[PDB]
């Protein structure tokens, strides 16, 4: 029903700048209260700022002189701008409309932002071939491995999202090198393993790198 | 600012029962509190406001209450999808804030995992680094136990585990651990084993393979 | 209805609550000096 | 801003004759145009000063003509070195602008394509996407038309094509086209064919192969 398309997110080095934004599918951003909230793993969640329907502004003391909010009526798009972050600010920021006494009614899906002087790195993907043994049954598990990238997260998809059931994915994990690593697995019926070959589609959006790898039984008795 | 406190730090109830959640604050709110739900990888959803004003899209199973810095939410006839973290939101002043959060878990039954091993692939060795992963999927509870044995020696310090999240439909966990090796250590060592203990298993299960299997 | 909000909101005071949210009555006094005779002055200047 | 129009769309003629390149502007000027040459992938070169003044590094075969709003370029005794595209830019004021370009082609004689179709490689089929490649070589006219047929059903609209510039040595052209489909769709039909229509042939020539032929 009611949807808000988000944009922005990505890596920035300290001392830099970035402009974030999100848009409205149907709702009038110009005529309702709008606010940002930033959510960080292991640290919690916080309230950032807001614009009142009269255009007035109001912030949280933690980002004064460093954050600013506004709203462009020409494109019905809320905007957000950044000055001189801190490592603590590492978090996922969200756009959401609230009304009156601050029920945060409808939400966007959120977009991560990462700060570091470390540069971007493309991911590497290693597919996994199912064993001959797992084909002895109704269903079998097919998966792949993605690692040696920076930064998190990495979106994954199998057969361009055509399938829906049996897909399990793992959260990313820090390498001692500073990179991350993750994995995925999809469950499928046994009959088409020798007939249908399933291909995983990977998205490392912050580097905007895509890698596509196949999964085939091949032969493991060796 | 004003701080909120949530109890319990963890709540786990079985389906069909009635769960209860209570929140406390340093200074009163005068019945302006609110509850939000957020499943993992999803956006938060509004549930109930003030003492008892439930949201539009929420079923009657949800009900809260309270006044004077002590506030309680109770949910009847728990259903599997209801697993999530929950959040109370403050109204007393500017700035706003909201509490640490509460995670609720369902208990249905105990079931054994499925254990698999996967050898390092050719691209890994070409890169000069090899790694070994063992996968434990579809088990209950979260607290599964797994060990790695290298040439009959316990190499407890060179492996890293990874945890999934609760599948709502099935109510089972899954676990992955990775053994990381250097090329020379990989070639020098030959026999690789993993030992797993789980409550859903009648007996501990051990899986192993030889490097010579390629 | 949905996205159709009634423009006002009630305060709904409760007595036992804390002081910060308790009702208060405010009076604002304004002084205006137009190019016109003054109509407000101070009383106390009398002596016997 | 003043806009130019170069005419005709393309120029196709044999060497040794006279060339005629016409240009029109939105707004009337007086001797405020010029000409620029470019052999593809090179540096554009300045041709003609004003309407009729020729640069010193440029032989006598060229001649430019201009008016209030109509302007035409003339070159005589066409030679192979002349095969290139031709551009108009305004040395008047607006501030300055340019034109859309026109290509000159040197004509010797008609030659039919060399057509060979090649099946997808093993790596492509392994990746889940299949494609079919048809190659046309050493043909003139450039207006060689290529179409794909699968099980004798026309599917020419599943391709993206590019054609090389003129071959200086052979006065001909070569074309690259690819017909690509998913592996399941590629398995749906049985025979794949490509149709080529050309002037040098008394009729279009078609080559084909069966999927089962590997």
Helices (H) and strands (E) in chain A, counts: 0, 19
User: Residues in chain B whose beta carbon is closer than 8 A to a beta carbon of chain A?
Assistant: 32, 34, 36, 42-46, 49, 87, 89, 91, 94-98, 100-101, 116, 118, 121, 123-124, 133, 135, 137, 160, 162-165, 167, 174, 176, 213-214
Tell me, letter by letter, the H, E, C secondary structure of B161-185.
EEECCCCCCCCCEEEEEEEEEEHHH
Instruction: Return the bridge partners of D140, or none.
Output: D111
Cα–Cα distance, B178 to A83 (Å, whole number): 40
Residue B208: its H or E element = strand B205-210
Neighbours of D102 (CB within 10 A): 20
Interface test with D, best of A199, A200, A212, A213 (most D CBs within 10 A): A199
| Chain B residues closer than 8 Å to C3 by CB | none
Q: Are strands A103-107 and A91-99 parallel, antiparallel or unpaired?
A: antiparallel
**Cβ pairs bridging A and C (under 8 Å):** 5
**Furthest-apart CA pair in chain D: how many Å?**
69
Euclidean distance between the first and the last CA atom of chain B, given in angstroms as a whole number = 61
Cα(D11)–Cα(D73) distance, integer angstroms: 12
Residue with tokens 């005629």: D20
**Burial label, B155 (beta-carbon count in 10 A; 0-12, 13-18, 19+):** middle
Q: In terms of residues, how long is chain D?
A: 214
How far apart CA A197 and CA C22 sit, in angstroms, is 68
Measured distance CA(D77)–CA(D106) in Å, rounded: 11
| Inter-chain residue contact C21 with B27, CB threshold 8 Å | no
Dig out the tokens for B1 from the structure: 């600012």
Using a CB–CB cut-off of 8 Å, the residues of D that contact A are 126-128, 183-184
User: How much of chain C is helix, strand and coil, in % rounded to 5?
Assistant: 5, 0, 95
Where b means 16+ CB within 10 Å and e means fewer, D162-171 reads: eeebbeeeeb
Provide the greatest CA pair distance for chain B: 71
Q: What angle do CA B66, B72, B74 make, to 5 degrees?
A: 125
Check CB contact of A101 with chain C, cutoff 8 Å. yes
Characterize A40-76 residue by residue with b for buried, 16 or more Cβ atoms within 10 angstroms of its Cβ, and e for exposed: beeeebbbbbbbeeeeeeebbeebeeebbbebeeeee
Three-state DSSP string of chain D: CCCEEEECCEEEECCCCCEEEEEEECCCCCCCEEEEEECCCCCCEEEEECCCEECCCCCCCEEEEECCCEEEEEECCCCHHHCEEEEEEECCCCCCCECCCEEEEECCCCECCEEEEECCCHHHHHCCEEEEEEEEEEEECCCCEEEEEECCEECCCCCCCEECCCCCCCCCEEEEEEEEEEHHHHHHCCEEEEEEECCCCCCCEEEEEEHHHC
Q: Do chains D and B touch (3 or more CB pairs under 8 A)?
A: no
Retrieve residue A188's tokens. Answer: 């499928």
Q: Which residue of C has its CA nearest to A98?
A: C3
| Structure-block tokens of residue B124 | 């890994």
Q: Which residue of C has its CA nearest to B92?
A: C21
SS3 state at B142? coil
**Inter-residue contact D123 to D177 (CB < 8 Å):** no
DSSP characters over D66-79? E-SSEEEEEE-S--
Closest CA to A8 of A89, A83, A152, A114: A114
What is the CB-side half-sphere exposure of residue D10 using CA atoms within 13 A?
A: 8
* A160 shares contact with chain D (CB less than 8 Å): no
Task: State the Cα torsion A189-A194-A196-A201 to the nearest 10°.
Answer: 90
**Which of B32, B36, B121 has its CB closest to that of A126?**
B121
Method: cryo-EM
Answer yes or no: are the C-beta atoms of A108 and A94 closer than 8 Å. yes
Query: Which DSSP state fits C43?
Result: -
CB contact under 8 A, C16 and B93: no
For residues A72, A78, A84 and A88, what is the CA-based torsion angle, rounded to 10 degrees?
Answer: 170
Is there a contact between C14 and B67 if contact means CB atoms under 8 Å apart?
yes
Q: How many Å apart are CA B152 and CA B43, to the nearest integer? A: 47
What residues have CB less than 8 Å from A164, skipping those under 6 apart?
none
Distance spanning both ends of chain D, measured CA to CA: 59
């Amino acid at each position: 029903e009611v949807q808000l398309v988000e944009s922005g997110g990505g890596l920035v080095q300290p001392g830099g700048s970035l402009r974030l934004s999100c848009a409205a599918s149907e709702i009038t951003v110009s005529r309702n209260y709008m606010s940002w909230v930033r959510q960080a793993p292991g640290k919690g969640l916080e309230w950032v700022s807001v614009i009142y329907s009269g255009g007035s502004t109001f912030y949280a003391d933690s980002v004064k002189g460093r954050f600013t909010i506004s709203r462009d009526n020409s494109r019905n798009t809320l905007y957000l701008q950044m000055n001189s972050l801190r490592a603590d600010d590492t978090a996922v920021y969200y756009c959401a409309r609230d009304y009156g006494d601050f029920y945060f009614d409808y939400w966007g899906q959120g977009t991560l932002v990462t700060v570091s002087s470390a540069s971007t790195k493309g991911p590497s993907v290693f597919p996994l071939a199912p064993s001959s043994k797992s084909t002895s049954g109704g269903t079998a598990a097919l998966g792949c491995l993605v690692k040696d990238y920076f930064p998190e997260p990495v979106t994954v998809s199998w057969n361009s999202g055509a399938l829906t059931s049996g897909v399990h994915t793992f959260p990313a994990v820090l390498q001692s090198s500073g990179l991350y690593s993750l994995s995925s697995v999809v469950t499928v019926p046994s009959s088409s393993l020798g007939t249908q070959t399933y291909i995983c589609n990977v998205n490392h959006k912050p580097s905007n790198t895509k890698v596509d790898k196949r999964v085939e039984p091949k032969s493991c008795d060796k | 600012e004003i701080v909120l406190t949530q109890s319990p730090g963890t709540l786990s109830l079985s389906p069909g029962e009635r769960a209860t959640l209570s929140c406390r604050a340093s200074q009163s709110i005068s019945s302006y509190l609110a509850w939000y739900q957020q499943k993992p990888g999803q956006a938060p959803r509004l549930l109930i406001y003030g003492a008892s004003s439930r949201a539009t899209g929420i079923p009657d199973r949800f009900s809260g209450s309270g006044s004077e810095t002590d506030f309680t939410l109770t949910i009847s006839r728990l259903e599997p999808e209801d697993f999530a973290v929950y959040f109370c939101q403050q109204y007393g002043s500017s700035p706003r804030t909201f509490g640490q959060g509460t995670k609720l878990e369902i208990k249905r039954t105990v079931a054994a995992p499925s254990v698999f091993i996967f050898p390092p692939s050719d691209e890994q060795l070409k890169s000069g680094t090899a790694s070994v992963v063992c996968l434990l999927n579809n088990f209950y509870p979260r607290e599964a136990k797994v060990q790695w044995k290298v040439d009959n020696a316990l190499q407890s310090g060179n492996s890293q585990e990874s945890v999934t999240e609760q599948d709502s439909k099935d109510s089972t966990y899954s676990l992955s651990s990775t053994l990381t090796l250097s090329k020379a250590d990989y070639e020098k060592h030959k026999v690789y084993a993993c030992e797993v203990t789980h409550q859903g298993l009648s007996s501990p299960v051990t899986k192993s393979f030889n490097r010579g299997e390629c | 209805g949905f996205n159709c909000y009634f423009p006002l909101q009630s305060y709904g005071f409760q007595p036992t609550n804390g002081v910060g949210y308790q009702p208060y009555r405010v009076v604002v006094l304004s002084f205006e000096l137009l190019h016109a005779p003054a109509t407000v002055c101070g009383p106390k200047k009398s002596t016997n």
